[PDB]
Design a protein around this ligand. Structure first.
Ligand SMILES: CCCn1/c(=N/C(=O)c2cccc(C(N)=O)c2)[nH]c2ccccc21
Length: 294
């Protein structure tokens, strides 16, 4: 369900960055901004095709919309995400934006909403396999999140059974989502302290290492997070369950529709002594929670 496009109708504006594969650049098309992805080397052709056939089947507000695909120089034509990537908002530009507990929870809810749609696909469920903030885009002033890069570095978000070579299911995305939840709450890069080549993270995670626990994290959120981290994929919740849980929790996180507009100088202190401080503040959550339960 595409819509063939002629390159001459595009007219590029400027390169904005590289995706998981290929290059992305802003462009105009029929009186509206556009992002187009082209393959640099022909080795990326396989990824180009799979993403083409997969994105043609998806239609969800939390997944990047694919308009068409031109085969003259071979490129995908998608919607432009003005807000950039979530990874950039979290750890990127020199003037970093302030965000609240409501934004963090809202972002993770919207991500689970999109993945739940993929996992519900018929005949076969669609697994993303590369869920991480670099592949999550933001629009509407940083309020709306959209999943991108369906072509399938990423070791910090990968379930052990995946790089274990073992067979895996849709539950590998659940593991990645859990890491993302920890990441937005702490505004820390997962396993940044380990570093080195990728196999050093894989070894740690394979032996059961997980990101440190979060001081004063509400037990309902801690439970969900650590369940997603389970070694055994069958002990992880389905995305449908995560959506339901996160939806119910948002009752205690008002203000997710407030755009990102304030800067901050995120200090990020080196204090990984078992526990870790959250970046967001859960004071209001505990207050609103006590109102209902009392
Ligand atoms: C990695 C993010 C690159 N980037 C960006 N991407 C997109 O609009 C986009 C849209 C659809 C699909 C994809 C993809 N990867 O399949 C990407 N918009 C940006 C605006 C400012 C700075 C960087 C930007």
């Amino acid at each position: 369900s595409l819509h063939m496009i002629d390159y001459k109708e595009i007219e590029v504006e400027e390169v904005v960055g590289r995706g998981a594969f290929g290059v992305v650049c802003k462009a105009k098309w029929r009186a509206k901004d556009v992002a187009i992805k082209q393959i640099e080397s022909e080795s990326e052709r396989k990824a180009f095709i799979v993403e083409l056939r997969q994105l043609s089947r998806v239609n969800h507000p939390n997944i990047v919309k694919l308009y068409g695909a031109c085969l003259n120089p071979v490129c995908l034509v998608m919607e432009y995400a003005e807000g950039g990537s979530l990874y950039n908002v979290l750890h990127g530009a020199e003037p970093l934006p302030y965000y609240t507990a409501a934004h963090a929870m809202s972002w993770c809810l919207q991500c689970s909403q999109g993945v739940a749609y993929l996992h519900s696909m018929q005949p076969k469920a669609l697994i993303h396999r590369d869920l991480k903030p670099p592949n999550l885009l933001l629009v509407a002033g940083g309020t709306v999140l959209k999943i991108c890069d369906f072509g399938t570095g990423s070791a910090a978000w990968m379930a052990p059974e995946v790089f274990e070579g073992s067979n895996y299911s849709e539950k590998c995305d659940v593991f990645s989502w859990g890491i993302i939840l920890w990441e937005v709450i702490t505004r820390r890069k997962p396993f940044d302290e380990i570093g080195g080549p990728a196999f050093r993270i894989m070894w740690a995670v394979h032996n059961g290492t997980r990101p440190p626990l979060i001081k004063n994290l509400p037990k309902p959120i801690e439970s969900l997070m650590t369940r997603c981290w389970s070694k055994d994929p069958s002990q992880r919740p389905s995305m449908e369950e995560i959506v339901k849980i996160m939806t119910h929790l948002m009752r205690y996180f008002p203000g997710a529709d407030e755009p990102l507009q304030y800067p901050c100088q995120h200090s990020l202190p080196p204090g990984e002594d078992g526990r870790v401080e959250p970046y967001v503040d859960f004071a209001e959550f505990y207050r609103l929670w006590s109102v209902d339960h009392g």
